[PDB]
Paper text:
Single-particle reconstructions imposing icosahedral symmetry were calculated at 4.4-Å resolution for the procapsid and 3.7-Å resolution for the expanded capsid. In the case of the expanded capsid, there were interpretable regions for side chains for most amino acids, enabling atomic models to be built for both the major capsid protein gp89 and the [name] gp88. The model of the major capsid protein revealed the canonical HK97-like fold, with major insertions that result in a supersized capsid geometry with an increased lattice constant. The extended N arm reaches toward an adjacent capsomer, forming a “crook” in the expanded capsid, and contributing one strand to a four-stranded β-sheet. Moving upward through the capsid wall, two further antiparallel strands of the β-sheet are contributed by the E loop that overlays the P domain. The outermost strand of the sheet is contributed by the N-terminal region of the [name]. This interaction is observed only in the expanded capsid, as the auxiliary proteins are only present in the expanded capsid, at the local and icosahedral threefold axes. Only in the expanded state do the E loops become stretched, adopting a well-defined β-strand conformation and creating the binding site for the N-terminal strand of the [name]. The [name] trimers, present in the expanded capsid, further stabilize this state.
A key step in the assembly pathway of double-stranded DNA viruses, including bacteriophage and evolutionarily related herpesviruses, is the packaging of viral genomic DNA into the procapsid. During this process, the large terminase protein docks onto the portal protein, which is embedded in the capsid wall, and translocates DNA using free energy liberated from ATP hydrolysis. Cryo-EM reconstructions reveal modifications to a canonical capsid protein fold, resulting in capsids that are abnormally large for this virus class. Structural information on the portal protein, through which the genome is packaged, demonstrates that the capsid influences the portal’s conformation.
Author numbering:
A (entry chain C): 1 to 52
B (entry chain C): 104 to 409
C (entry chain B): 53 to 103
D (entry chain D): 257 to 307
E (entry chain B): 206 to 256
The structure:
């Protein structure tokens, strides 16, 4: 059961809308994005007994 | 005498859930609960395969299968003791294999223990073991005890004062299982899959410190057999079906509209080959061989909860 | 450390993390005769990060 | 003596299985006898199998 | 006699074992500047491995 999310739009809509706080003018910047999968790899089904 | 069991469980989806479901960041139509019910269908399928494997693991583990109202996945509380009548389910070890007294001296001898099990099951030609299926690090218990070290040192000639200085423990465990297999003949299988229980700590399927023993051959110990459930009136009369079923129900016209999926099955494992002259059943046995095996194992990562 | 160069003056990274749910559970047990009971609930989680 | 061992300079301690695999052979070879093993049994009236 | 403190081969072997399930951490290579054999030749546990 995954969260019903679109990762591209959610990953694009975190970037700040206006947010001039630092230098009192908008700076130049570069942004790279990456997602990550998280699972428990060590929860494996008990494949032994169906063989028997 | 033999008699099956029954299993069933349900879902539901109300009107607010079917009508309102959008994606979390995209802006789309009402079409997400269609994709959402398919995961519940697949989850009920895997949820039934887990009870097949659970019943069969329970009969291999304890011989009997025991259901009781304290169980997690039992709301009904149906108490059951289905005693399959395994004669001697466990093998006695008063002092375990990794039990040392004094200064490095061990207590018992594993290779000799399986040797006189084979010898004292001579004229019972069905109690005489063939294979072992042990999961965790088992070579270390063969590598630290006294007698199997003395057998490796007998075989490789490595007397400590004259041939070589002292071999490391790693050189012991890289051949201890092989000399064990050669001096007994029990083909040892390994099965090291794991399940994450509610502690958050990884445990193997074969528990550490225990090994199973098959008693006549490696093969099917009986079978798991389903029985028939109800499917309704193909022509005018009731015609059954046999496997695990899964039923969907539309109530999207009713007040309020809802939607429910129901799956379940009927079945129970059966032990086919019994003894004839006596009514015994010596086909698989357990034994707990050591106590401190987790210290021989690498640690496991925590579950990321983010 | 190799050399690369950019015409811009800031670099930020956005990391997103996703923990889908695991299909645990076991089918409930009833006697032939009885109506069914519903299963429990579970949760998946999504987090983010900046640089 | 017959195999070429010593408990201090060739092997550590040979196991009992090698002793019983070689003992009947060296018994036949030293004594010059002929061993006719005979294993057939009969039930007693007490249920106990007796040779 | 010269029985040292830490067996370095067992030390790095324990660092490789205790990062079996942490594959980002399990070390692979190692850079050392000065005379490094001048310490391994003066270590009793390493000398026993050589013997």
């Amino acid at each position: 059961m995954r969260v019903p999310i679109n990762i591209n739009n959610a990953l694009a809509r975190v970037r700040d809308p206006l947010s001039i706080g630092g230098l009192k003018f908008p700076t130049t910047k570069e942004i790279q994005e990456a997602v990550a999968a998280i699972a428990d790899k060590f929860n494996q089904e008990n494949d032994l007994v169906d063989r028997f | 005498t033999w008699s099956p069991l029954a299993f069933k469980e349900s879902r539901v989806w109300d009107e607010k859930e079917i009508l309102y479901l959008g994606r979390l960041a995209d802006e789309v139509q009402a079409g997400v609960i269609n994709e959402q019910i398919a995961e519940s269908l697949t989850w009920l399928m895997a949820r039934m395969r887990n009870r097949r494997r659970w019943l069969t693991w329970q009969v291999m583990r304890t011989g009997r299968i025991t259901i009781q109202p304290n169980d997690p996945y039992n709301p009904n509380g149906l108490k059951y003791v289905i005693d399959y009548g395994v004669t001697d389910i466990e093998l006695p070890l008063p002092q375990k294999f990794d039990a040392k007294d004094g200064n490095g001296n061990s207590a018992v001898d594993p290779i000799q223990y399986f040797r006189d099990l084979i010898k004292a099951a001579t004229y019972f030609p069905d109690r005489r073991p063939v294979a072992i299926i042990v999961g965790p690090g088992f070579d270390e218990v063969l590598a630290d005890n006294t007698f199997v070290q003395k057998y490796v040192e007998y075989e490789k000639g490595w007397v400590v004062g004259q041939n070589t200085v002292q071999p490391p423990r790693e050189v012991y465990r890289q051949a201890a299982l092989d000399i064990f297999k050669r001096y007994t003949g029990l083909e040892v299988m390994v099965y090291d899959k794991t399940y994450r229980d509610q502690d958050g700590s990884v445990k193997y399927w074969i528990p550490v410190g225990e090994l199973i023993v098959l008693n006549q051959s490696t093969g099917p110990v009986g079978r798991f057999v389903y029985t028939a459930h109800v499917a309704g009136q193909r022509n005018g009369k009731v015609v059954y079906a046999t496997g695990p079923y899964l039923t969907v129900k539309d109530h999207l016209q009713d007040d309020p509209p809802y939607y429910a999926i129901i799956a379940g099955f009927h079945g129970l494992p059966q032990l086919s080959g019994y003894n004839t002259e006596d009514f015994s059943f010596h086909r698989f046995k357990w034994l707990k061989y050591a106590n401190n095996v987790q210290s021989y194992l690498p640690p496991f990562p925590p579950k990321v909860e983010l | 450390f190799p050399e690369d160069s950019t015409f811009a003056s800031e670099l930020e990274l956005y990391l997103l993390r996703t923990q889908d749910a695991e299909q645990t559970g076991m089918t409930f047990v009833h006697q032939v005769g009885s109506t069914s009971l519903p299963v429990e609930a579970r949760v998946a989680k999504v987090d983010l990060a900046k640089a």
